[model samples]
Every structure is written in structure tokens, then in C-alpha cells.
Target: SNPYERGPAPTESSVTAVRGYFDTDTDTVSSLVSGFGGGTIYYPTDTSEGTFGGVVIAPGYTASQSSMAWMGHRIASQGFVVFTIDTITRYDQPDSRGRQIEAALDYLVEDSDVADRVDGNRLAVMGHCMGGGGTLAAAENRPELRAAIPLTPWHLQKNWSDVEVPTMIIGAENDTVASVRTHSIPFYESLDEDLERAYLELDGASHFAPNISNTVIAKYSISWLKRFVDEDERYEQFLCPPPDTGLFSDFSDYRDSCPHTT
Candidate 1:
């Protein structure tokens, strides 16, 4: 049995459900914390599954965790300890946001109230827009990270061949702010062919898609996190052969290095 695996068997309905089997709880991290403005920590109240992995989420440019707040609860309900953080300042850049994400995770793993409930070795990063850029940055600098998911991510740099972390890039097909053409696609293409990576282009979605409550994002995200962070092979079905990218599907495109080795 896998020590890291947690929760019940997964299905389309279970993965996309607004809430999962766990009851969630939240706590506010103080703004006084150094390196980041600080925000909220969402976690499962049930300890029956033992410690869960940690996931840190950041908002896009000039925004606070409020924009990504719903994501925190949505993901934590599925079993991870999720942190929705505020950048050092609302105007902070991607690089700064990256470090702030790491700092918040440190608080989560070693100091936050839920610290004891987190497995420091298993961690992830995710965000929106510029914050998504930082998601790559943080993962790049820390190869030990289990996963990274950037939503309609925007950043100055495009190539990301150096990041060894398993990443899933979710971009919007019609987004002009960080067009998949110039941003998401290139970034995804840059990753080494062998690196475990995937690109999801949301049909008719925008750069702000990650800011809302969308199961499309949650379903795939939960599957990715479960497969990678927890090393749970059961969730692999949702990933390999990749999900539908047909004309009528919510996705315009879906690509992955399948038969995921884990």
C-alpha cells in the first residue's frame, strides 16, 4: 500500500464535485509574515487519511488571494493542505511572487497551525496569470516540488526546459492577455519532451478563467495533484490517453506525455 495515497476511489463525478469527502477548515495567515503579505490556509479537518501534501496558490498581477480563494477550499476538500497567498505587495512581480509562494509554504510546512498535517517533502505550486509565471519560477528553483499548475499563466520568460517538476499548464484559447500562442504554448513546448507535462487550453475561456469557480479546472487539477503528489496510480486513468479535446468539449486542446511513469 502507498503511504502517500489518501481518499476514496475516484470517478468523474467525484473529481468534479464542488465538495469531496473531507470536511474543510480555514485559517488566516497574518500579513506581518516576512517576504509575503500572507493570506489563507485551507485544510481538511479529517486526519484519518494522515498528512496530506501542501499546495500554494498565488493570484495574478495586482490581485490578492481573494481572487483565488475559492480554489483553496475547492482543492483542500479533495485532501491537500492548500494555501492561497497574497504577494509581498499587490504590485509585486512574478519573481517576487514566486519567493513569496515558497515562504508561505514554509509557514505551512513548519509553522502554520496545519504544519503538522503537511508532508514537507510533497509540495506543489499553482497560480493565475503573472502568478502562474511565478509558479514556473518556484518550481524551476526547487526541483524537489512534486507538481506545478499554472492557469492562463503570464510572464516575461517563455522557455521552461530547466524545470524538472511535473507541471500542467491550463491556458485559455481566446485569452489575449497571455495568449496561448505566445505564452502557454511556448512555455509548454519548451519543457523537455520526457518531462512529465501537459497543456490544457480551455475553449472560449479567458485569462481570468482561473479566478472563477470552474469544475473544468478543478477536475483536471485534482487528478494531476493526486497522481503526482500522492503518487496515487488510481488517478492516472484521468490523465493518460489524456482527457477529451474534441470540438464540443470544454477544451480546445489537450496534450501530455502519457503512460505517466510514477
Candidate 2:
């Protein structure tokens, strides 16, 4: 069911609009949080409600938290408590990656300083490549998640109909590492049709597409977070109507169950 087509609020801004940066002075920091195995946390510098949605992100296999640092900085600027975490072991499997992400989200909600700033119930998870697949597993295992965004994910199975969270799967068209047809498309298809979901295939993109900070990706990611994570209607315009044909040639495929009306 689609929510209404609400206009932007005075506080609402374009998803691509730069809000601010992660500062050592304004935002809280944890080089390595005591709990949750190990990870870095970035608090929102300017949040309207004092409490913000929390997002936990993990990098691909053999990748470190620094790999997803762009997301931490960009998303946090949009008023979110972001955690870019590292797997205890680079060789860890998808389940292991899911556990670590879950742990970090739990820590965000339980930590005194962090908890006071984040909404315990508003949580999302994202990742790239192997970590992206792990994001799927994490959301499935913890259905309480507000959203799940996996970029060029690689997984062993195609049956993920159990994933009920609002999901957005991004694929790299020219990605030889994890072919779009083999990985991303199927993952998006596996999601339950009843839930709000979207599949985006980047034109001539590679598996490493997400490594570099992209404005398009940033826009949609933040929009999804705002719509689902914050339950804010102001973001409705950005997510629905699916972009006009050729408007965004970089995005080959953009399909979703948005404008979902009950």
C-alpha cells in the first residue's frame, strides 16, 4: 500500500543535498566501541528530534570499515546515527557478518550516549558485495529492521522470499564479480511482493561502484531511509513515481512498489 504524495517539509531537503560533515567536535566518536566486537560510530551533528534513526553498515569481504566510511559521513549528515563496522575476521561468512551488524545495532540502542540520540526501533542495515548479502541475512533474521539496502550483493541462494523488510537492492550492470542477473536481480525478486521493494541497475557499473561515493546512490539511499526509517512522509516524492525514462540513464532499471496505497 502506498502512502500519500506529501510535499517536502521546511526541514526536508533533497537527498542529494549536502547537510554537513562528520566533525570530531560536533559528532560523537568511538574509534572502537567496547561492545559489538569492534567498530566506529558517527553521531548526527544536527538532528531535529534529538533522536535519530540508526543505520549499521558493513563492507565487503576483505574490506574494512573504512570502505563504507563515505556512507557514515553522508548518511550521518542527514541526521542518523551511523555505524561502519568490520567483521571480526575477513574470512567470516554471511551469517557472521549478519551477527556483527546486529550486534552493532543493538549497541547503538543500548549505549547511554548513543541510545539517547537514536530511536531504538528505527534501524536499518546496508553493505556492499559479501557484506551486502549479509545485510539481507541480517534483515531476515531480525524482521524488526526498518529497511535493507544491499549493493551488488553476492549470495549462495535465490530463495529470500522470507525477507519482509522494505528493501532496495542495487546492482552494477557490468559487474563481472557478481553478475546482476546472478546476484542483485534475484535478490530483489526474492523479496516478498507485499513489502515495499525496489531494484536499481546502474549503467555500466562495476562491483566496486559503491566504493566510490555516488550522488545518485546517495540520494536514493537517504530517501529510503527517511521514508522507512523515520516514517516521514516528506520523502515520498523522491521514492515514488519511478524516475522518468532517460531522465537517469545511469540507472538502467528503477522499479518499486512505492506510492503504495492501502
Candidate 3:
């Protein structure tokens, strides 16, 4: 549950006031920390009720939140409370990973300017590769997140014991770099709950192909997030594919109905 009470969100410049658009590169998402190369937070300029849904995105290894700017901008364009965190130096650093993710959430909850606009009940974290693993770690650690979508996630063996939040793992069929069979497969089997375990494998796709070039893969991944997190039923269009003869191996389509929720 959320740790804050419902009330008008505070504006920037107040102690509890959270500011939007952090300068970039600092550990903080909204502060204008020069030369930091951290992440940025985008809030609805309108600040209407329920306009901010909140999404935290972590980039892959060797990548900063700046590298994952496309995702952060895309989600924010949709008007959700969005943050893209920089984790280039903290991919394997456990405390740094947890702290950045936790602090980002805390800012949204405590900052008044952005608080009143957020649903608080609906939040998600999407990460790529190394950051994908961080996404799972954060979701497992936090109770407020409604869903998690980790694309080509890596480093699951380290902490598979702690994942409990609703998750959707999108893997590439030919991802030899971080093979799904090696990482995602084992993690999926380890989940004790019959939680909505939706898996989609793109044929002839490489490790980065899904997010980089495969339009179909990108479309489906975004649809998965919208459907599961926003409850936008229209997302069904891209969640599942029509049954094909040999296109699929054993993938289950979530377009119809997905019971697992936050």
C-alpha cells in the first residue's frame, strides 16, 4: 500500500514539494545536478487529477538512463508520472540499484507537485537487460508497484528467490548473449505463484533486435505494458497474435484475459 495520504500534491520549492525535470546525470531524478548524467522525471504540465500514473525505467548494462530516454519519453508522452534512472555505474552494485529505484519512488510519493497527480496505486518499472534485472529486484522489494516488464533481462540467478510482483518477461528466441533458456526460463519455473507468467519469443530475433529493430516486438512489448498496467483494454490488439501454423512454439496469448494483477 502507499505510505502517503490523499491530498493536494505539493509544488516545487516546498520541503515536500517535488520538482519535475531534474537537470540530468545526478543520482536524483529531478534535481538539476550538472555533469551527473543521471535520469530525469517528467510530470504533466496540466497537473490534473489522476494524470500521472508513474513509470520507472532502468537502462541496460553500460548504459545510462540517457540511453533509455526513448522509453522514458514515450511513457511520459502518454502522461504518466515517468522517471528514467541512470544506472550505468550501478548495474552490479546492489545497494546503488536498490537506492536509486527506492529514492525515485519516494520522490513521487512525497513531492506535492507530482503527488496529487499520481494514482500511486498504479506504478510499473521496465528495464532492459541488466536494468531489467534491477526492475525485477525493485518490484520484488516494493509492494506499491502494480506490474513489471523486463525486456531481455539479465542477472536473474543472483536473486530469483525474491521476485513476487506481477511480471511479463519478453525474450528473443535467438538471444545467445543472455539466452532466455539460461535466465528467463529458470526464473519463470521458480515462481511459486501462478502469477500471470506471459512469455513471447520472436523468431530469428537477436538479443537487442527485439527492442532495436523488430517493430512487431516493440509494438507488443508496449501493448503488454499498457494492457497490464493501465488497464487499457485496447492494448489487447498487440498483446497476443492470431494463431499461426508454425510462427509460435508454445506461447500463450494474454490478449484475451490476464487475471494476474497488482
Candidate 4:
């Protein structure tokens, strides 16, 4: 039996649905937390499944934690402990955003009310815009991380050859802010050729897609977190070849090194 598998067996519809089976709850973290602006935590309320992996998501530049709240709540329902965090200030850059993500994870592990329900060793990072670039930075500094998802990331430093964590970058086809050509695609390509990585460009989407609700983002994100953080092979089916391809697809483009060597 897989001790790490907390929710029911996944199916195409299950992952694509608006929410998962796990009942979820949230806690608002006060602003006193050191290193990062305290935000909110969303966790599965099921006690029988044992501890779940955690994912800390940071907001884009000038945005607060609320931008990622819907995502955190939905992802948390899928059986992971998710933290939607704010930076010390809304203007913090990618590097600072990276540190805040890490800080929030530390708090979740040692001080949150649901700390006992989190598996500290099995944690991941995610972010949007500059915060997305921060996801890359976090992975670079902590190679032991399980996974990284940079949603329409924006950063000046492009090379990520040092990050060994499994990563899935979600880019948007119409993101004039951080175009796929210079930001997400190059960021994905700059990684080691054999790294566990995937690039998904949303069809007719913009950088703010993650700020709102999107099924394509939710399903693939849940798949990536389940696949990497929990090491749950059950999610392999959703990610291996992805469900569709370039023409007339929900996604504008997709690429991965699957039959995942990891």
C-alpha cells in the first residue's frame, strides 16, 4: 500500500474537476511571521490519511496572497497542505519572493496549527509572475525540494542548470508581460536535458490566469504535485504524454521528458 497516497485513486475527471474529495480548511497567518508576510494555509481535514506533502505558493509582484487563494483551496482539497503566502512587501523581487516561499514552508512545518499534518520532507514551491521566478530560485537554493511550478514566471536570471527538483512551468500564450519566448520556454530549456521537467503553455491565456480560476491549470498542477511531491505513480497517466497536443487543444503547447526517468 502507498502510505503517501491520501485521496481516492485519480481519474481524468477527478483531477479535472473543480475540487477533490478531501474536505479542506484554512488558517489566516498573522503578519508577525518572520522572513515573509504571513498569509493563509489550506489543508485537508481528513485525519486518516496521515501527513500530506506541502506546497507554498507566492503571489506575483504587487499582488498579495489572495491571488493564489483559490488555487490553494482547490489544491489543498486534493490532499496536500497548501500555503498561499505574501512577500514582506508587495514589491519584493523574485529573489526575495523565493526566500519568503521557503520561510512560509518552515512556518508550516514547525509552527502552523496543522503542522502535525504536514510532511516536512516532502514539500514543494510554486509562484506566479515574479513569484513564479521565485519558485525557480527556491529550487535552485534547495535542491532537496520535491517539485517546483512557476506560473507565468518573470525574472532577469534565466539559467537554472543547478536545480535538480522536478519542475513543471505553466506559461501563457498571450502573456505579453513575460513572453514564453524569453521567460518560461527559455527557463524550461535551460534546465538539464534529463531533468524531470515539463512546459505547458495555455491556450489564449495571459499571465493573470493563475490569479483567477482555470481548470487546465488546476488539473495539471494537481497532477504535477501528486507525481513529484508524493511520488504517486497514479498521476503518471495524466502527465506522461499530457491529454492533448498542439492543434485545437486546451493548451497552446506542451513538452516533457516523460516516461519520467525520475
TM-scores for all candidates? Answer: 0.98, 0.88, 0.70, 0.98
| lDDT (10s digit) by residue, model 3, range 89-170 | 6444433455566666666666535576667777777777776777777777885676777777787454454665667777
The parts of candidate 1 lying over 4 Å away from their true place are: none
Off by over 4 Å in 4: none
Candidate 2 per-residue lDDT over residues 203-234, each given as its tens digit = 88888989888887888888888788877766
Candidate 3 residues lying further than 4 Å off, grouped into runs, are 1-37, 46-49, 88-91, 94-96, 156-162, 210-214, 240-245, 248-262
- Give, for candidate 2, the lowest lDDT window spanning 10 residues: 1-10
C-alpha root-mean-square deviation, candidate 1: 0.8
lDDT against the true structure, each candidate: 0.91, 0.77, 0.57, 0.91
Candidate 4 achieves a global lDDT of 0.91
lDDT of 4 by residue, 1-262 (tens): 6678878889888998778989888899988989899998999888897999999999998999888889977899999999999899999999989888888989999999999999999999999999999999999999999999999999999999999999999999999999999999989999998799999999999889999888889998999999889889999998987668667888888998888754
Write model 1 residue lDDT over 130-150, tens digit each, in one string. Answer: 999999999999999999999
Candidate 2 local distance difference test against the native:
0.77
